[model samples]
Target: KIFKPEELRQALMPTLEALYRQDPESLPFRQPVDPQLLGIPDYFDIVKNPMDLSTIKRKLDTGQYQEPWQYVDDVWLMFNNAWLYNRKTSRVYKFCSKLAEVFEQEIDPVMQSL
Candidate 1:
């Protein structure tokens, strides 16, 4: 079942703490998950839940970046999440993109050489 807003908010804390602290050891690695591990803050920026591009920009603007590696890691994580949701929601649109690539290759002879 989907959790209520309060429940969802409570659930994100542990996860955020782990990320913020970079303390993998403090995270839960057990069965029957802990609620504290999931409690996230309720914020306006997250209200509509804008995806990757916006998220990267905000994170960059806030200067929370610990290093170059973390910046790329966070960006790629958001992108992959977006790609998965897109593929799930539009099966026909997904197939058509693949179809277009195959069809375009036939018309362009240099496609095979590349």
Candidate 2:
């Protein structure tokens, strides 16, 4: 079953936000997962969809995505709903890209992982 778009949005956004908010350079582990999988809206600029929760449910239920972290790609795709479905203005673009220096210094290298 497919999910309601807003429902998918609510479920996935926080996870992405949490991962993105953390400091990447100080990470204790080698980050087995790609950092870009986090999908923090303002930080990452790739045009991709965030995860679809229903697809994940089906995959897990059927044993398709046995590993928990395997769902990261799905979560990443879930964010695409915003760019594809929601309306955006020049101001939105302005705000998202406003901190060019910060993003360049902090987020750019992480994006290269994927």
Candidate 3:
């Protein structure tokens, strides 16, 4: 998720575009980019095997996909990249901190409640 600024913009634009198409008359909330129109952001270059859930389920069922958390790991590559590039506000470091908070406030309480 921590793509280069341009790439991050590119990444979020599609969802915005989808909103535009869904409601053309309304204020368009998205910045839609047609896949055909623009160069894919560099972030996608390394992690661009386009497959939907069914495809993933099939691959997993067939033993073709060996790795678990494929998407998370791929995104983590980007997160790590951004973290290294911006040492002070590293996404990974922030994520770890946030995750700790979530565990403390949400997970630990739920576990105790259980």
Candidate 4:
């Protein structure tokens, strides 16, 4: 289920402000603007709608939610954004790649064995 948009805005704002202050260039607006323009980064657009999963058993028993792998589509958005902003030596890209490798080597085999 999605959390309220306001909650996401509030929860993510502090991290956004900190990142923006550190690298203003990373927070480019959709349009060209005066360098003198002072404004907060519009993070609302980047923020994923918050997710709250009920207990695994509850979720499994109910038929409301999509299968778990369906969520993988959202994971690609991060990798795409990371590559878009920092193609080489991006921590986000590196981390996701490594995790994917782990899933293939470690997790996939277990599922296959089962």
Question: Which parts of model 3 are misplaced by more than 4 Å?
Answer: 1-67, 89-114
Ranked candidates, highest TM-score first: 4, 1, 2, 3
Q: Which residue runs of candidate 2 sit more than 4 Å off their true CA positions?
A: 1-51, 89-114
Winner of 1 and 3 under lDDT: 1
Please, what are the lDDT tens digits per residue for candidate 2 over residues 1-114?
333333433433444344345444213111222335744444334434334344545554455653334555553344333334334663323322332233344433333433
Question: lDDT of all the models against the reference?
Answer: 0.36, 0.39, 0.34, 0.35
Question: Per-residue alpha-carbon lDDT of model 4 for 15-72, expressed as tens digits?
Answer: 2233224332323321232223524244334433322112222333443225333333
Cα RMSDs of all predictions? 20.1, 14.7, 14.2, 12.8
lDDT of 3 by residue, 1-114 (tens): 233333322333332233233332212112222234544354345434332223323343454433333422432443344344334664434643443333234323322432
Candidate 1 worst ten-residue window by lDDT: 25-34
Kindly provide the TM-score of model 2 when superposed on the true structure, using C-alpha atoms: 0.29
Clashes of 4: 0
Q: Which predicted model would earn the best lDDT?
A: 2
